[PDB]
Amino acid sequence: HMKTAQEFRAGQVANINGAPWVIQKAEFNKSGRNAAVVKMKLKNLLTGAGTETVFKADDKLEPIILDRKEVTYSYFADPLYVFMDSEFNQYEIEKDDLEGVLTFIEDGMTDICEAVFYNDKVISVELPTTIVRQIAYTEVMKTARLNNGAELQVSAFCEIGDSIEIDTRTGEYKSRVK
Amino acid sequence: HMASWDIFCSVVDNYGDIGVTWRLARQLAAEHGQAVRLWVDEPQAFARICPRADPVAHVQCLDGVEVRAWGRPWAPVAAADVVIEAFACELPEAHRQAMRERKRPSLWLNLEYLSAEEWIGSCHALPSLQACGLSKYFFFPGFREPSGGLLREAGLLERRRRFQASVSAQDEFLASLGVRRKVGERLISLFAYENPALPGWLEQLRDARQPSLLLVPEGRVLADVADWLRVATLAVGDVHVRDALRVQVLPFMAQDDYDRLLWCCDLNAVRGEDSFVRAQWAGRPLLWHIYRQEEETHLAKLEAFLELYCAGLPADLAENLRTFWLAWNAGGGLAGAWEGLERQLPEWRREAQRWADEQGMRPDLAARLVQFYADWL
Numbered sequence: 001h002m003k004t005a006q007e008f009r010a011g012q013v014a015n016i017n018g019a020p021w022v023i024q025k026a027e028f029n030k031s032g033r034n035a036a037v038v039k040m041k042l043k044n045l046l047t048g049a050g051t052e053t054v055f056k057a058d059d060k061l062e063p064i065i066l067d068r069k070e071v072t073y074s075y076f077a078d079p080l081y082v083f084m085d086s087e088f089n090q091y092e093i094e095k096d097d098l099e100g101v102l103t104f105i106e107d108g109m110t111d112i113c114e115a116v117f118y119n120d121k122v123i124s125v126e127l128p129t130t131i132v133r134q135i136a137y138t139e140v141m142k143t144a145r146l147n148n149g150a151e152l153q154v155s156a157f158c159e160i161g162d163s164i165e166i167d168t169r170t171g172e173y174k175s176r177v178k
Numbered sequence: 179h180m181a182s183w184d185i186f187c188s189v190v191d192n193y194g195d196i197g198v199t200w201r202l203a204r205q206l207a208a209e210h211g212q213a214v215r216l217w218v219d220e221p222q223a224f225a226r227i228c229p230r231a232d233p234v235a236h237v238q239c240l241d242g243v244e245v246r247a248w249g250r251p252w253a254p255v256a257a258a259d260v261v262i263e264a265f266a267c268e269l270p271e272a273h274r275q276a277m278r279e280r281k282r283p284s285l286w287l288n289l290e291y292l293s294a295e296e297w298i299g300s301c302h303a304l305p306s307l308q309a310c311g312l313s314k315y316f317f318f319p320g321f322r323e324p325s326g327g328l329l330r331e332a333g334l335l336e337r338r339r340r341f342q343a344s345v346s347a348q349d350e351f352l353a354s355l356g357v358r359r360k361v362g363e364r365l366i367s368l369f370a371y372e373n374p375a376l377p378g379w380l381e382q383l384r385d386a387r388q389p390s391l392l393l394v395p396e397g398r399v400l401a402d403v404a405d406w407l408r409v410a411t412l413a414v415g416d417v418h419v420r421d422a423l424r425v426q427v428l429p430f431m432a433q434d435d436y437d438r439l440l441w442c443c444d445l446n447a448v449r450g451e452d453s454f455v456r457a458q459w460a461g462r463p464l465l466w467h468i469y470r471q472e473e474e475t476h477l478a479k480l481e482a483f484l485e486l487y488c489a490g491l492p493a494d495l496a497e498n499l500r501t502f503w504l505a506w507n508a509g510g511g512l513a514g515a516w517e518g519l520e521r522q523l524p525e526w527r528r529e530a531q532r533w534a535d536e537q538g539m540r541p542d543l544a545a546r547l548v549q550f551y552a553d554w555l
């Protein structure tokens with residue numbers, strides 16, 4: 001039950017020497033030749049301590065699969081983000097625990113997210129594997145921008161105001177509506 | 179205190195893997211009194227940059243360094259106080275277990291590749307949390323802070339200034355290589371990979387107004403020079419004249435003699451990472467053939483150094499520099515760029531000296547490794 005360090009994403013948890021660490025931020029960097037480096041911002045899930053670690057892209061870590069519960073986004077308080085489940089329970093999440101959602105977060109977001117729990121305590125929120133975003137600006141593929149300002153490569157057939165699908169595990173274009 | 183250091187060097191290709199680790203190993207023994215074991219899996223490559231080395235010996239002592247062949251299969255031995263896997267190579271599994279069976283487990287360091295990109299600063303000196311509890315950190319060389327600095331021997335720039343200010347010292351060294359510069363000749367060294375832009379540049383040196391002496395160490399670029407010279411074979415000691423261009427083939431020399439070669443020339447064409455830095459210590463204009471990577475990853479690394487290196491340059495000199503290096507690493511098209519650089523060679527030289535002297539004020543990488551280990555105890 002081991003995973004490659006470059007396969008981890010924000011919001012996931014790894015078991016490192018008996019300590020459960022939540023990954024608040026994962027960044028990929030290409031070093032020399034074919035080598036690569038993954039920098040991680042971690043937070044201990046029992047003592048709360050935070051640390052930064054670095055791995056080879058091929059290094060193997062033991063993930064920890066956690067409970068989940070469907071949740072949706074409501075508004076942005078300061079400086080916390082509030083999420084609500086199907087039973088109108090509020091979940092206030094810090095900005096450091098939402099680096100996976102912040103890339104495609106939008107006002108009035110209709111996506112059905114999943115809150116990651118560690119012993120009945122929410123630690124992060126994950127977007128669905130596929131999301132539907134509208135293109136706010138654009139000129140095989142070309143550069144476009146979404147309503148929240150993010151930049152990603154989309155199909156050249158797309159235009160202003162079209163609907164596209166995004167794969168949140170990669171943050172890349174998937175398809176578009178006719 | 180005298181601590182033992184294991185340095186594992188995997189020669190993937192070329193010579194920069196063993197060049198950097200040998201330079202580091204030699205410096206930890208000489209000016210820090212450390213015990214060093216240099217493990218290299220391609221002893222033939224080490225013998226190329228160290229002529230005194232025996233390429234067939236399993237172990238030999240050179241300049242206070244214990245150089246061992248990295249054999250396959252690996253023979254288990256005791257681990258040193260510090261274990262360095264250079265360039266993110268993979269340690270032997272049995273050696274990682276020897277690192278744990280000690281009163282104080284070995285300090286584990288990954289000496290990463292050299293890059294001028296900003297991301298290496300946030301990763302330098304960060305821990306690499308191991309599932310076994312071994313204390314591992316990544317060590318990034320760098321041109322700016324924060325980083326691990328650059329490899330620089332004690333008194334290197336002082337010896338380079340005394341050498342360049344002595345006409346007799348420069349002529350005596352060149353005479354040891356069988357080289358005599360003609361009056362008014364411009365000296366250029368050529369160390370690169372297979373470069374399609376080379377013949378176009380040689381044509382400009384051939385048709386130029388000032389004569390040039392191109393000193394080419396034996397290597398991969400010789401086939402391109404021979405094709406341009408239109409000769410079948412180029413051997414060490416050959417001298418060919420093409421109008422204002424003189425081409426002489428030099429032998430692959432010891433690492434310290436390669437320094438003195440770079441110190442003699444007005445323009446050093448270098449490559450990789452070690453000779454790239456060595457040309458910077460020379461305080462002379464530089465031409466960099468960066469190691470090509472997939473998906474044009476090296477272009478970001480080339481631009482990152484250029485943006486940092488061209489900070490003190492005037493705008494027109496910085497533009498000619500970026501255009502030439504880009505053409506030097508991505509197909510010909512450096513005609514007008516070379517004409518612009520050739521006109522401003524004195525000014526470029528003065529800025530190359532300032533860049534070396536400012537870099538020379540930063541503590542060297544070997545000293546940062548010792549301070550890192552001392553503060554880690």
Ligand SMILES: Cc1cn([C@H]2C[C@H](O)[C@@H](COP(=O)(O)OP(=O)(O)O)O2)c(=O)[nH]c1=O
Pocket residue numbers: 191192193194195197198226227228369395429430431432433434436449450451452453454
């Ligand atoms: C040309 C030459 C290089 N060298 C050394 C300098 C450098 O340490 C090494 C080249 O390493 P480097 O500059 O990193 O480039 P690459 O990895 O592509 O080979 O070879 C010599 O020792 N003698 C020489 O004559």
